[PDB]
Symmetry: D5
Subunit: 170 residues, 10 copies
């Protein structure tokens, strides 16, 4: 069962990830005081390109500018992640990744966020926005064929940051 609810504390997670070509540990508490964008993707080494996943890495300086962490996640391993990172974008790989890419091989994080496709053991294209106090603020879940807009995600986070300080105004 899903543990993700709007207004309630975001489901806690701890796993290995790949960041700057190295294995590192990533917890939700590590990003206390910051806004967090956690987004899921189905599979490593898919024939259709990860242009959407790349787009979040390329435009990370914009997220860093707003003091916002971006975390990528799938049910593939950290070893699978690093390999796809080591694959050039010319050969349908990820190339250099400026965001951490999380491994959810135990399916725990997908399950907790309720984005697991049970009959396949892979994650739907979900995207979650978590505030500085660790409260879940936004849920977005897409069916497999359709990716997510970076512009929209930026619009949402800035809207949330603005409404945090200002409440409801123009």
């Amino acid at each position: 069962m899903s543990k993700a609810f709007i207004g309630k504390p975001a489901p806690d997670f701890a796993t290995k990830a790949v960041f700057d070509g190295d294995f590192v540990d990533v917890k939700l508490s590590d990003y206390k005081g910051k806004y967090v964008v956690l987004f899921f993707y189905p599979l490593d080494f898919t024939f259709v390109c990860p242009t959407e996943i790349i787009a979040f890495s390329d435009r990370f300086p914009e997220f860093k500018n707003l003091n916002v962490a971006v975390l990528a996640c799938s049910t593939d391993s950290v070893f699978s992640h690093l390999a796809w990172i080591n694959t050039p974008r010319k050969h349908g790989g990820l190339g250099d990744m400026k965001i951490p890419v999380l491994a959810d091989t135990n399916h725990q994080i997908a399950k907790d966020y309720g984005v697991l496709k049970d009959d396949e053991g892979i994650a739907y294209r979900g995207l979650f926005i978590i505030d500085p106090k660790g409260i879940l603020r936004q849920i977005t879940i897409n069916d497999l064929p359709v990716g997510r807009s970076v512009d929209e995600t930026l619009r949402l986070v800035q809207a949330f940051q603005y409404t945090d300080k200002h409440g409801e105004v123009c």
Copy 2:
């Protein structure tokens, strides 16, 4: 109790009264087979907060109709409450003319089924769902109360789903 909304599975069935074209009409999910459906929730009628978010879907509905997509607005307010707010001009902070149906979920049933109900208040969160011609739920968007939704993004999603329905996904 439990949300019935799942990606890949049939979208939760709903049947309620609504306001369309200044009349009370019956609205069922079956009424929209062979068509894409965008169902979106809002919290309250007669809010001091700008309804420009809800109005935007009505104003830009010709864009949705052009793509053969039905748009449905919904809240836990009454069908009478809907009509009164529609009858209020936009100058006084009303909805004015609505080109889309506004569903009444005083039942709380649809909000519950789509899992968008704020239990302690009996109002719906700013959720928006995309349902395909086959009655299969394709997209879930739930926002916390202060942040509204973008029409452009909703259009970007629905067009992407329609394209991927006939074609396969393609990289270059």
Copy 3:
């Protein structure tokens, strides 16, 4: 499901309401030592003019004269109430309301008093009388098409007030 019983403590409630044009908090404990009359109505902005609801507001000086609080309630929002209050009575609105109008978007108060029409999420035309000690004394529930009488409500409260002090009757 219902928590309302005669001779037992009346179901506790706390919600937002509209009184004198402002949003205020209403708790049951706020009316300790007074008799309370809590009455429900189905919907805001009905085509049927709300003459029964208006009558309890207009004749409230009589209730105040007896040190009796009168509270109106429905499953509509506080925003919905205020809009209907701001609507003139000639245009089928409530007009000036001299009693507080409670918002039960929770369904909690209706459920607790057992006046909720489940299939519609609206309250039946119920009326309840609660004594100074917070004990429920009277239960009245009407089907939707029929409203309530202020004269009866006053007769009931005055009968309860008299029997609290005296108890028994010559006729």
Copy 4:
């Protein structure tokens, strides 16, 4: 425990009663096509004179005029009723009763309508209105010290009778 709900079929009952000085059987189905007013009272032979019960008997021609049946009921025996009927009104009795007085020694009818004071085995001062189609339309329950008004009962039935044929109101 209770079976009584607004808009649902009224709880079915069949018991012995006293009408016109004889023991007769009373079933709910016997009053199909008529509006029924069923009201409960606590006890036979109270020191309090039964003026409220007597008033419904005396003013019954008005109820008959509207094709409306009126039934009184308590948890006392049919023998107890008849004795109280045979007691003159000047000696704190019922006198001539022009309506049937039902014996609920079963507690069954009281339980079904949810007016039973469990700890005492007596019924609260409840009144119920049932339509020609056997659907419950109105619920009224009073704490013991306070009786009911015939004028209100007539106002209610006439309001229900009018709205059955017409439905909506100008005022």
Copy 5:
């Protein structure tokens, strides 16, 4: 639901209102410790059937008092109903003066506890119980409605119990 009356065990405890000497009094089983108690039930007040059975226990109560035995009458009629029937003279088919308390079990609780309740009518069967000084139930007699009970037999039993309490049983 269940009868609580058992031979050798403590008799079911009861506490109710009653009519004694033209007044409403409170009656408890504890009020009779160190004394033998005869508790008997009857069906209805104001019966067309001769109450001579109930009256007989009142009339011959001096015989019971002489043996230091308390007699209690009971039915599921009200304490007000009891008084009205007591106030009715024996010439009109009343009880007249009652030298014993008449308990009101409108509660149905005592009838239930002694298992004498005719469920479908909410009346008590013609049951009669004998309880010793220690609050131990000693004798159960339950009769079907048409047949009354004998005072002489009740006296024969209570005297036998008192004799066997101090002495042992003896043959010759």
Copy 6:
């Protein structure tokens, strides 16, 4: 649990008994159309005499005159019964018995009539009156030290027989 209730069909029983010095089978259905008086007693060969039990045997011609069967019962065996019958009344025995004496060694009949003293496995001094249609009409249960009156039993049966034909009259 007890199965005996006033107005309801009397608990059915079938067991061996001793009648005229022989073992015979006795059923409740055998006495259909007749009134039946079933009475229990605790024990065979008690030092206190069975004068009460004897009294029902001696005065049986009175019961036979009213077409009424009298049945005695205890949790002793048929062999124990016959032996006590074979013991002369001079030596605290039963002597000749004109009523059948039932054996309830399985405790089934006592249990069904709810007269069993569990901690001892013996029956209390119970007496039950059953009508021609097999309906239980009267319950009498005495504590061990106190016996039962034949006069009272006769009064009851005749009252029941009268009220059967007449209803309620003088």
Copy 7:
């Protein structure tokens, strides 16, 4: 309902009245600590069939006493029934003088605990049990109704148990 007798386990505890030397006495299992006990059941008192097999245990009790062994007879007959059968001469099919205590189990409790109760008749099967000084069940013997038990065998068993208590296995 459930048997408690298990080999190698503490023998089911019992306490009841019995007849010994023509007197009512209380018998407990704890009374026989530091000693071997032979408890044997029989069906009925005043059985037409020869009780000689039961009698044989009483007559040859000097042999059991010589080995420091207690013998106990038991049935679901009363303690009064036992004494009466004891007072009946052996010539007239009685027990006569009994050197061993005869236990009354009108309770059905001891039979149940040893699992020798014939439910449909409320009588005990011809069971025989051997309990050691520490109170541990060592031997179970249960015969169907028509067949009795051998005193020689009982003796053979008990002294074999006594021998193996101190020696073990002489091969």
Copy 8:
């Protein structure tokens, strides 16, 4: 798991491999319908204690055969263990030649059914059971491990049952 062995009830059914006349054979209780059957249990093969108790039943089998009685021995050892012990001469603490079948209960099933299984060791107590022609259990004998059984006693019992089958109604 609890015992299935009751007197007067059909004896627990069994089917296992056994060693008869130096060969492996299949043994069923149904095989002895119409005959009296004596089934006895023993703890272990290759014990330092003389199997003289077991031997005695084998040697004196012509007495049982004369009375049309089958005799079955059993333990929780294998058939391979049985044959090994049978092939061991009696001079070297073996069984020697066996006139009776020796049943193997390696799965502990038959011991469990007859309630002779010592759980903590997985071995059978020295039990002996007598079953009639109709397959009804007639006699239960369970001994603790250190004490053996008497053939004369077994024979006395068997004949007593055969006599009472023919007549009953005994006066010994």
Copy 9:
């Protein structure tokens, strides 16, 4: 949650996608009736540790084919991950050409059914199973993560099973 693999029982049935000869193919257990199957699990794709032990089964598959035996490799990695690692040269720590099918169990289903799933990591232990032609599980081998399996041993086992299928026991 529960393992289904039992010796002497029908081997747990499986159906999944796999990589064979550089193509995505469907693999079922029913596909291998009338033949011996060796199913073996491995933890992870693109592991830094030498996959040579896994590779050895592919290289020496001619020996397995010679005995009419099917070899199946499996892990909780995707079918896309398998192919990518296959396309990675053995010089760069890849699989290279694989003569045997490599099954994808992102389901976790097959690992669970064979009871080789390491729950906390969602990866399979180094398990190896031998299934006969009738589809009955004959051998279970499970190794902890750091230790691999011997092809010689797998061969020794399978041909021993094939020999005993037709001969029994040559003593």
Copy 10:
């Protein structure tokens, strides 16, 4: 009853009688704390099949001792059966002298715990288990009855674990 044997978890605890150096001894798993332990199961004593598979582990025990490894054999036969088979010369299909302990599991407890018990026969499958110094299970091998185990394989596995304990982080 189900299996308690899991990889990475503490190995199931056992305590039974065994035959070592021609004597009965008590064996516990706790006795080998700080050592690697190989526990293997076999079906039956006195089988017509050569116990050469069992013999091979006994003969080559000095290789296991060199690697500080204990080797334990087990079956559901008795210690009396074990000693009998050990005392049987290898020329006559016996075990002969045994350098390893042979555990008796007559109560079926250890087989059950390791999930190697064939229920319908009450015998153990040819299982082999490797336990580390901390008492953690490291390797499971279960064979069907007709197929034996390799000493070389057992030795290969043991050393691989000892090496990876010291270093880990392998690149074979």
